[PDB]
Design an enzyme around this catalytic site. Sequence first.
Site, PDB file in Angstrom:
ATOM      1  N   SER A  79       0.150  16.460  25.266  1.00 32.47           N
ATOM      2  CA  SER A  79      -0.075  15.916  26.618  1.00 32.47           C
ATOM      3  C   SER A  79      -0.832  16.751  27.548  1.00 32.47           C
ATOM      4  O   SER A  79      -2.197  16.931  27.087  1.00 32.47           O
ATOM      5  CB  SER A  79       1.481  16.019  27.234  1.00 32.47           C
ATOM      6  OG  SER A  79       1.650  15.185  28.266  1.00 32.47           O
ATOM      7  N   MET A  80      -0.452  17.193  28.526  1.00 28.99           N
ATOM      8  CA  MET A  80      -1.516  17.913  29.560  1.00 28.99           C
ATOM      9  C   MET A  80      -2.013  19.356  28.990  1.00 28.99           C
ATOM     10  O   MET A  80      -3.149  19.661  29.265  1.00 28.99           O
ATOM     11  CB  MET A  80      -0.609  18.503  30.971  1.00 28.99           C
ATOM     12  CG  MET A  80      -1.691  19.123  31.799  1.00 28.99           C
ATOM     13  SD  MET A  80      -0.664  19.383  33.292  1.00 28.99           S
ATOM     14  CE  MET A  80       0.130  20.980  32.828  1.00 28.99           C
ATOM     15  N   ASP A 110       1.873   1.253  34.740  1.00 28.75           N
ATOM     16  CA  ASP A 110       0.633   0.835  35.033  1.00 28.75           C
ATOM     17  C   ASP A 110       0.132   0.802  36.768  1.00 28.75           C
ATOM     18  O   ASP A 110      -0.842   1.150  37.029  1.00 28.75           O
ATOM     19  CB  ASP A 110       0.086  -0.440  34.316  1.00 28.75           C
ATOM     20  CG  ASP A 110      -1.170  -0.820  35.074  1.00 28.75           C
ATOM     21  OD1 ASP A 110      -2.406  -0.523  34.237  1.00 28.75           O
ATOM     22  OD2 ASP A 110      -1.329  -1.593  35.793  1.00 28.75           O
ATOM     23  N   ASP A 122       2.051   4.971  25.642  1.00 32.89           N
ATOM     24  CA  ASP A 122       3.273   5.734  24.735  1.00 32.89           C
ATOM     25  C   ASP A 122       4.497   5.995  25.733  1.00 32.89           C
ATOM     26  O   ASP A 122       5.248   6.812  25.369  1.00 32.89           O
ATOM     27  CB  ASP A 122       2.674   6.977  24.202  1.00 32.89           C
ATOM     28  CG  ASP A 122       2.336   8.232  25.222  1.00 32.89           C
ATOM     29  OD1 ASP A 122       2.828   7.895  26.351  1.00 32.89           O
ATOM     30  OD2 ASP A 122       1.753   9.376  24.813  1.00 32.89           O
ATOM     31  N   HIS A 178       5.957   9.366  23.891  1.00 28.72           N
ATOM     32  CA  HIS A 178       5.034  10.383  24.263  1.00 28.72           C
ATOM     33  C   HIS A 178       5.743  11.957  23.753  1.00 28.72           C
ATOM     34  O   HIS A 178       5.155  12.705  23.323  1.00 28.72           O
ATOM     35  CB  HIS A 178       5.015  10.202  25.785  1.00 28.72           C
ATOM     36  CG  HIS A 178       4.242  11.472  26.255  1.00 28.72           C
ATOM     37  ND1 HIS A 178       2.694  11.468  26.059  1.00 28.72           N
ATOM     38  CD2 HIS A 178       4.226  12.479  26.933  1.00 28.72           C
ATOM     39  CE1 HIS A 178       2.447  12.571  26.737  1.00 28.72           C
ATOM     40  NE2 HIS A 178       3.233  13.178  27.297  1.00 28.72           N
TER      41      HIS A 178
END
Length: 376
Positions: free
Chosen positions: A162-163, A304, A324, A356
């Site tokens: 992730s980040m 989104d 994800d 995710h």
Amino acid sequence: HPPVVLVPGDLGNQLEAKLDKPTVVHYLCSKKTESYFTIWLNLELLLPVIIDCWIDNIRLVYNKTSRATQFPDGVDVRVPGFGKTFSLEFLDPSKSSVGSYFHTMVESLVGWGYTRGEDVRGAPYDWRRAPNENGPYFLALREMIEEMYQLYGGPVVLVAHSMGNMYTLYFLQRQPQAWKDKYIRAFVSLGAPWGGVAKTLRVLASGDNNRIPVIGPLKIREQQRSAVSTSWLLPYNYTWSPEKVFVQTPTINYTLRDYRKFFQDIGFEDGWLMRQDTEGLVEATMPPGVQLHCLYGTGVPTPDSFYYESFPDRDPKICFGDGDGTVNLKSALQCQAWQSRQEHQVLLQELPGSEHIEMLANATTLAYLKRVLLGP
Ligand SMILES: *[C@@H]1O[C@H](CO)[C@@H](O)[C@H](O)[C@H]1NC(C)=O
Ligand SMILES: *[C@@H]1O[C@H](CO)[C@@H](O)[C@H](O)[C@H]1NC(C)=O
Ligand SMILES: *[C@@H]1O[C@H](CO)[C@@H](O)[C@H](O)[C@H]1NC(C)=O
Ligand SMILES: *[C@@H]1O[C@H](CO)[C@@H](O)[C@H](O)[C@H]1NC(C)=O
Ligand SMILES: [Cl-]
């Protein structure tokens, strides 16, 4: 097998605090502690009312003069377990399943012959901040990588979630190519939000309590806004069209060209200053310059854009695209763009149906990693 460094995402390692506060928001909040205690993740700190104490300690204060964040008066926050794995295996030191994060992956690595704290090490950081306020972390990471190379006799594989991928890209963009060629074997990138993620808009506008539904979204929004890393991950124009509308309300639309207005209109002008501080940290086009394995989930509805009937203090309706669950699919086009910009190979690997967080404990993810580390 090569040495491995694990780089977590947002919320992705323990944090500890020590207190000597002049005032508290409720009498049930501690003013003073003699030692550090775990401030993330401890579920008992997140209950109604008590959560105000937690917010008061874990929030960052933005100082407009220094253009930097600071901790509240009388609060210190430290990151335990640098160079070890415990603080990213389990977010909750009770070792409850709620906080099991890198544990499944490290169990696998150890079964393959790795040793915790030796040839597999974690690189936890203060994930409330963006890379501009984590200079000392990057110095320590560089030193740790060099030490692992010298001890274990070869270059390291970076594995980020992730980040953590954006932290890792920042780091690699700033190291000379010759350093990377000597010290980095490969970068395995899991669920990278290259170019930011759409759900950051909802977090900043109206809060996100989806993982703590007994607490109000407007209450938790206080903490979420205070974390610079949130504003750092607003959508970027190297992934998203500048004309894509992320937020609609009855009277105004917001695209990625409208962040200054957005921050004015939600009543959080410091967020604009944080975005200005952080939007240029990661070079838009520059590849990492190492062998890259880009693993990305698909087939999971991913926020989104958002429609607000009342903005910004009520939850929006959500429009979903592919990805994800958290990272929008169009993040993967960034890796694809890097293929023609670096000599080192870029391998793309779709993970259909892989959510995710679940991707970190998923057998297909682990089988891919095994092939990278142990060979054919
Ligand atoms: C803001 O930072 C400036 C410059 O470092 C410092 O002098 C000032 O004390 C800080 N403000 C607060 C409220 O801490
Ligand atoms: C892309 O975004 C950056 C800030 O993130 C901005 O400075 C630049 O003007 C944008 N480029 C466009 C719209 O062509
Ligand atoms: C925002 O854009 C949408 C189409 O993308 C449009 O239908 C709507 O009228 C716009 N809203 C405002 C307030 O301008
Ligand atoms: C694990 O990931 C694979 C490949 O994306 C996916 O097909 C599978 O459904 C995932 N497993 C679980 C339990 O979600
Ligand atoms: Cl290569």
